[PDB]
């Protein structure tokens, strides 16, 4: 059946080439380019004592949670740099953290193969583990809440999972990746999510159906970071091949590549500005590069981290970008 | 500040104090990354020292060790191998009685050891190499020669010489001045691998300190 699989792959390639009328760069040749997006470190979040692997902004655009290998999940008041909570993890090997959209929960996970759900708002004044989501046979590399009861996780077991937090059971398992799944991005409508894996492919999943709608393959190496465009009709991937790629869901192919000859390091994290014209990517070369998502131009640089920028996030109101890094600091930028 | 802002700042300061205390307590831990391949003596040395990552905590001669057993992670190591970039040493377990077995076991262990040695995150990370099952190796080396694994051996078939050749093959992968491979041969019935790891870690710390002073 390998012949039929190759035939269907060639049919998909032909259908993608039939839609490749004019590249994104040909249509965005006339928009005024952004001049120089010069963000400045407004806050520096100090208090992690190891490499920060994940951060996730709150929906209030003021609180954010960061995950560090020091075994601490810290919730930051990014306006005042106050530490709202410092959650001691059972496993210090956390590499993902998600802040629930309601703000009542935070999630984290990593080499323990568990998504730990933490109740931030309990009658007792401490944050406790509300649920530990076991069932992944590899490390959890990303987790994102759909709501207070549903969270999507990606794992090094090459699968993604949808969980019911109350039952602590996998409602849906999203299989189809052959490499380790490294990142997740939920659509703004949260009806569907994209996952990027070590197989150098991004797969689009229906949350309710539990099936892979589309598979996106432009990257030459492991995809570490994935993020939808703000309207949910596109997403950007960040991989180890020093390139960022924008894939359209409807066009079902890559629309733009965000690469530079002076960048050879891998890409750890990607996020979009509120309008989605800026793609902010975190790199192994210790800084974050800001990309004109429409013109692929390198709009700006966020230098200021002494180690690899492992994570970054834009606030839901678009005011600020927080970049975490292996140097144990989070910086808020404007 | 507001009264509530002032109390929030006080809470943040208490959190910062606890974070500093936790980091101080954590910096006193000697973190060991246990590696190896399947049926090597990883579990044997974990039992001697005493879910995706297993963490063995032990104290030996006033030194607290955190041994991270990550063999359950049946995924791509390079995606999570940087998590252990700052370990004091890697403990690599190799079954000596694996030269005669294919599933070659000893070629797989050598390839894994080479990848760990020449990993960009372990450039200066010393390795406490354990050559496990030396007794089974001695049992099966008198019958079958050390040619099923290494055709280019062309040496004596005695246990000591074959084991020394295997150790030399493993240390040939070091190719680094700032990293040392500490090789010990174990038989699963010796209660001194705790001492071996303690001495290797002491040597690693001493050599790191000497490198700091420019004396190494």
């Amino acid at each position, epitope marked *: 059946l390998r012949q039929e699989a190759e035939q269907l792959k060639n049919q998909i390639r032909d259908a993608r080439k039939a839609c490749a009328d004019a590249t994104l760069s040909q249509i965005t040749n006339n928009i005024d380019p952004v001049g120089r997006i010069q963000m400045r470190t407004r806050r520096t979040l100090r208090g992690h004592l190891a490499k920060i692997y994940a951060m996730h902004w709150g929906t*209030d655009s*003021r*609180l954010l949670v960061s995950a560090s290998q020091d075994g601490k999940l810290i919730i930051w*008041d990014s*306006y*005042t740099t*106050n530490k*709202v*909570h410092a959650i001691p993890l059972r496993s210090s090997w956390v590499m993902t953290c998600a802040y629930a959209p309601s*703000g009542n929960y935070v999630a984290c996970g990593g080499l323990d193969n568990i998504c730990s759900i933490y109740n931030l*708002k309990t*009658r*007792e*004044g*401490n944050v406790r583990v509300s649920r530990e989501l076991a069932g992944h046979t590899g490390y959890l590399s990303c987790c994102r809440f759909l709501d207070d009861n549903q969270i999507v996780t990606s794992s090094g077991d090459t699968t993604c999972a949808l969980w019911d937090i109350e039952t602590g059971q996998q409602t849906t398992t999203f299989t189809g990746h052959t490499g380790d799944v490294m990142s997740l991005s939920l659509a703004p409508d949260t009806r569907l999510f994209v996952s990027g894996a070590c197989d150098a492919s991004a797969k689009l999943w229906d949350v309710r159906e539990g099936m892979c709608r589309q598979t996106f393959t432009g990257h030459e190496s492991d995809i570490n970071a994935i993020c939808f465009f703000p309207n949910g009709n596109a997403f950007a991937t960040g991989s180890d091949d020093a390139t960022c790629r924008l894939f359209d869901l409807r066009a079902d192919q890559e629309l733009m590549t965000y690469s530079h000859d002076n960048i050879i390091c891998g890409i750890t994290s990607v996020s979009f500005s509120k309008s989605g014209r800026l793609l902010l990517a975190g790199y192994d070369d210790f800084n974050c590069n800001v990309w004109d998502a429409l013109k692929a131009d390198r709009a700006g640089v966020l230098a200021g981290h002494d180690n690899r920028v492992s994570c970054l996030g834009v606030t839901d109101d678009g005011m600020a970008v927080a970049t975490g890094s292996w140097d144990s600091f989070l910086k808020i930028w404007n | 500040l*507001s*009264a*509530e*802002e*002032r*109390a*929030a700042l*006080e*809470r*943040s*300061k*208490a959190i910062e104090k606890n974070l500093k205390e936790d980091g101080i307590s954590a910096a006193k831990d000697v973190k060991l990354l246990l590696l190896g391949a399947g049926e090597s003596g990883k579990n044997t040395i974990v039992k001697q020292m005493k879910t995706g990552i297993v963490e063995t905590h032990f104290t030996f001669k006033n030194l607290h060790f955190r041994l991270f057993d990550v063999g359950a992670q049946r995924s791509e190591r390079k995606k999570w191998i940087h998590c252990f970039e700052d370990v004091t040493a890697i403990i690599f377990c190799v079954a000596l009685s694996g030269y005669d077995q294919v599933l070659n076991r000893m070629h797989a262990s050598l390839k894994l050891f080479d990848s760990i040695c020449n990993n960009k995150f372990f450039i200066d990370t010393s390795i406490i190499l354990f050559l496990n099952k030396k007794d089974l190796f001695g049992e099966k080396i008198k019958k079958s020669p050390l040619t099923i694994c290494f055709p280019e051996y062309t040496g004596p078939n005695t246990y000591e010489d074959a084991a020394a050749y295997i150790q030399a093959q493993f240390e040939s992968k070091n190719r680094s001045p700032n990293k040392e491979i500490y090789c010990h041969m174990t038989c699963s019935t010796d209660t001194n691998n705790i001492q071996v790891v303690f001495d290797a870690v002491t040597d690693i710390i001493i050599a790191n300190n000497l490198r700091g002073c420019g004396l190494y």
Partner: single-chain antibody
Amino acid sequence: VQLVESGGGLVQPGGSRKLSCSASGFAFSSFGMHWVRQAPEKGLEWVAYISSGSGTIYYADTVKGRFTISRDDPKNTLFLQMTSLRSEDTAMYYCVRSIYYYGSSPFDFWGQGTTLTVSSSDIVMTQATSSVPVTPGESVSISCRSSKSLLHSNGNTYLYWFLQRPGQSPQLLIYRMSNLASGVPDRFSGSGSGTAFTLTISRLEAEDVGVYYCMQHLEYPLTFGAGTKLEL
């Protein structure tokens, strides 16, 4: 979560005794602790505050120097050492659970209280109305006035609404102006701006009968308005 006070009783004027608070069911060490007293017929009046970790301690001017608030985190106990017990110190003394971080709900849990009986610049909260008669099912708005703007430059308006039900300890309804407390039905509403505040009850039940108290938390000598009672 429960806070159990002990002590109280009857003392001679000029005497001394220690109030205790047996906290249980919550992370007592992480909460700032208040003593708030209520004279037998008058409204609530904040007495003393000990922060989480005992780093910060505040007192009302009428008890400062003579009263000493202390906590013992390992035994989850809060103390009020009272000295030179004047006749004005007779009241029901309430221990109040309060935690402070962004988004937190201070003054959210109150102890049952113990009655102490003694034998014989501050911001002002004004509740002009009192003992307003209400009819179940219809809306009522309880007004509050502050001598100073409770709105801070940070954007928060540190106005608290408490419901002291008959015979029951106070119960937070709204913590910062227009912020519904946990477990409070979403028919209580808070609004206002600057110095003028109203608490609207949409469809008042028979359980909303009680005295409703203001509280500012802007400047620390926390002051309650004289309660606005609701009666059938």
